[PDB]
Structures are given as C-alpha cells and as structure tokens.
Design a protein around this ligand. Structure first.
Ligand SMILES: O=C(O)CCc1nc2ccccc2nc1OCc1ccccn1
Ligand SMILES: [Zn+2]
Ligand SMILES: [Zn+2]
Ligand SMILES: [Zn+2]
Length: 101
C-alpha cells in the first residue's frame, strides 16, 4: 502493498485550479503524451522517469514534492521516494478520475 498513509509534504499540496485537470495534457517540455504527471503544487504537467524524466527535472528545479500520475492516479513524493495516499489527495484524484474515465 500500500502507499504511505501520510507524508510531511502533504502541506505543500495546493488548491486545485478551477480549470480542473486535463489527463491528456502533454509534457510541458518535450510534448510527449506518454506517462505524464501533474504537479500538486503548481499544476504543471511533465513526463515520467521512463520517458524523458521532465517531472523529475521539475522537482529538482522547483522543490515541489508531490505529483499525480495521469496513468493510474497514484501520487508520488520525490522527497519520501514513495507513493502517498491521504484524504488531502481525494479531491484532486477524483477530479482526475472524472476527466479520465
Ligand atoms: O516518474 C517520476 O518522475 C516519478 C514517479 C516515479 N518515480 C520513480 C523513481 C525511481 C524508479 C521508478 C519510478 N517510477 C515512478 O513512477 C512509475 C509510475 C508510472 C505510472 C504510474 C505510477 N508510477
Ligand atoms: Zn517530457
Ligand atoms: Zn510544481
Ligand atoms: Zn513526502
């Protein structure tokens, strides 16, 4: 198995844009449609580590901790190096779910 039930970076999760989420939004750097994530601090979208690693780059240059997968709606913390699930993430996950499915 399960994600962590809490992490010390949940405090950095910011309010969801009224625009909502677009789970088909491409990577802001390379334009790939594959394995994208959305940053739960600034809501920029960048690709996963198995494509071009742009979300990892975003974490490195911003320090933003938590990102949500447009594949499976899991949330990853780059500081804790673990998946995290908590009530503080349910609204953003559900918005993504509604857009995706
Ligand atoms: O891709 C990112 O930038 C962050 C998420 C993530 N981090 C990793 C770090 C080291 C090894 C494998 C990883 N695999 C990762 O995500 C895999 C994945 C892909 C799709 C849905 C859920 N999880
Ligand atoms: Zn990319
Ligand atoms: Zn960010
Ligand atoms: Zn964390």
């Amino acid at each position: 198995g399960s994600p962590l039930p809490w992490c010390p970076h949940l405090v950095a999760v910011c309010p969801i844009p009224a625009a909502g989420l677009d789970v088909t939004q491409p990577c802001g750097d390379c334009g790939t449609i594959q394995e994208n994530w959305v940053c739960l601090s600034c809501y920029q979208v960048y690709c996963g580590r198995y494509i071009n690693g742009h979300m990892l780059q975003h974490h490195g240059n911003s320090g933003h901790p938590l990102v949500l997968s447009y594949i499976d709606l899991s949330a990853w913390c780059y500081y804790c190096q673990a998946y995290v699930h908590h009530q503080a993430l349910l609204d953003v996950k559900n918005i993504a779910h509604q857009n995706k499915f």
